[PDB]
Amino acid sequence: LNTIDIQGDILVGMHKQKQLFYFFAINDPATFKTHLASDIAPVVASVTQLSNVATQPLVALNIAFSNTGLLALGVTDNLGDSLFANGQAKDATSFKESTSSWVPQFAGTGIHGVIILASDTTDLIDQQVASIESTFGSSISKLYSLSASIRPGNEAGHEMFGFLDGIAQPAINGFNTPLPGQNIVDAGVIITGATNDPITRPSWAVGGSFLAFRQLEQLVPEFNKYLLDNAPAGSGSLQARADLLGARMVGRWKSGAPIDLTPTADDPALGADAQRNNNFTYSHAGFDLGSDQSHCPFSAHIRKTRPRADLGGSLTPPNLSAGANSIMRSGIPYGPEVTSAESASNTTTQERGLAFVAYQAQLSQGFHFLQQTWADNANFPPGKTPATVGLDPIIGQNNGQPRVVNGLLPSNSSASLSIPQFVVSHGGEYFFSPPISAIGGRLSA
Ligand code: HEM
């Protein structure tokens, strides 16, 4: 790997308090290219730079292009990815959703790219945006944007449902020092043209990655109310038992504690411990892997998206199964905190959610595969008893309607729940984040 030439959000994440997703079209390739080379390319933050606190810019900038943006730039080379080429709108029906609920700018292929601006204040971001718009002039056009932020206080690093996020990533072999239980993968799973990437890419694409962007609204008061209404009977407060159900749905407690290691009560100390909070496989000493949902439901979100021992491999950490289906996640929450009024009425009045960002070298193996073949598949994971696992309670989709999810109730692993959508996709796009040398190189030529 040459982490000098790889955009930082791909392998490191921007790790700033604020981010802006600036979605643009290219009006005029010729003028746009000039300013791409002079104004954008030299300030794109790399993995190497973001990997050291002393070399992190006040504004971390990354930029990615859609198939039609690349077309607008006169670049027609085959990036080796049909899903990217066709755009996410065309792919929506693969996830049993429709472009009906999408931001209208996303329901098409008019968006040519996205600029990711990140800084610890919104002030610095808007300065950089004002400069970009000034210098590019009418060669660029803003079609849509989404402002996002780290949540405040003790919810920093947690997503809108309140769960600590950004714990689990694939370790890239030869680059990351793997953590206990962490999967270890070839660089080519995430970085196009890198080690063991079987797909031929254009020359200017080596060091890049596909960026799956999803604007995912979360119905937080509704979720909270559902958990309280369905809290399993037992010891502790109603909220504690409600939290237990929530944790069974995610596969982690709000603290980050993986339920597979903490199956009856939260242990917040575990969530804060990078050396132990991923050290599991779903295998347990005296339990049948195929039928035991006492530690973690077969349908739990993280078990659906990283099956670990459910797809074979070592029963002791680290489990190394399904390395090719790993994704890097750089998502960040958007929208305001939940208000008292919303909580009292258990009803959302304004949009908040996750600005979901997934990187992978193959869309068909990454985001698209986890959503369609695993999360939305009522019979995944395979070989379980009962065999009908049901859907991912967090992201599983059923054309807008309630999702049948099994195994969630600790007192009865055959008990089914009919769970309304908590996450409402408003769509997004598939982009390609090029290596930095390509931005001021071929893409500006
Ligand atoms: C609003 C929607 C979503 C929410 C609230 C959500 C929430 C979470 C949470 C709380 C975790 C645990 C933190 C961690 O392990 O790092 C997690 C992990 C993860 N999620 Fe999601 N997520 C969402 C969307 C998605 C989507 C759309 C995908 C893929 C299609 C996805 C794939 C993953 C993966 C791969 C992990 C790590 C699993 C592992 O390595 O064990 N998430 N998510």
Numbering used by the authors: 4 to 448
The authors write:
DyPs (dye-decolorizing peroxidases) (EC 1.11.1.19) represent a new family of haem peroxidases widespread in bacteria, archaea, fungi and other micro-organisms. In the present study, we expressed A. auricula-judae DyP in E. coli, solved the crystal structure of the recombinant enzyme and several site-directed variants, and used PELE (Protein Energy Landscape Exploration) to describe the binding of its typical substrate RB19. The DyP structure is formed by two domains, each of them including an antiparallel four-stranded large β-sheet and two or three helices resulting in a ferredoxin-like fold (plus two additional β-strands). In spite of the obvious similarity between the two domains, only the C-terminal domain harbours a haem cofactor.
His-304 (Nε) acts as the fifth ligand of the haem iron, with Asp-395 at 2.66 Å. To identify the possible substrate binding site(s) in A. auricula-judae DyP, we performed 160 PELE non-biased simulations, where the typical DyP substrate RB19 was free to explore the structure of the recombinant enzyme. These simulations show that RB19 encounters several favourable docking positions on the protein surface, with local minima close to Trp-105, Tyr-147/Tyr-337, Trp-207, Tyr-285 and Trp-377 sites, as well as in the haem channel entrance. There is a clear preference for Trp-377 to be oxidized over Trp-105, Tyr-285 and Tyr-337. Finally, using QM/MM methods, we were able to map the important residues along the LRET pathway from WT DyP Trp-377 to the haem. This pathway would include a first 3.0 Å electron transfer between the Trp-377 side chain and the Pro-310/Arg-309 backbone, and a second one (2.9 Å) between the Arg-309 and Arg-306 carbonyls, followed by the Arg-306 to His-304 backbone to reach the haem iron (at only 2.2 Å from the His-304 side chain). The EPR spectrum of the WT DyP resting state (top) shows a ferric species prevalently in its axial high spin state (g⊥≈ 6 and g∥=2.0). After adding 10 eq. of H2O2, a strong decrease in the ferric signal, and appearance of an intense protein radical signal are evident (bottom) (the electronic absorption spectra of WT DyP, and the EPR and electronic absorption spectra of the D168N and R332L variants are described in the Supplementary Results and Supplementary Figures S4 and S5 respectively). The yield of the radical observed in the spectrum of the H2O2-activated WT DyP is estimated as 0.58 spin/haem. Simultaneously, a mixed tryptophanyl/tyrosyl radical was detected by EPR spectroscopy of the H2O2-activated WT (wild-type) DyP.
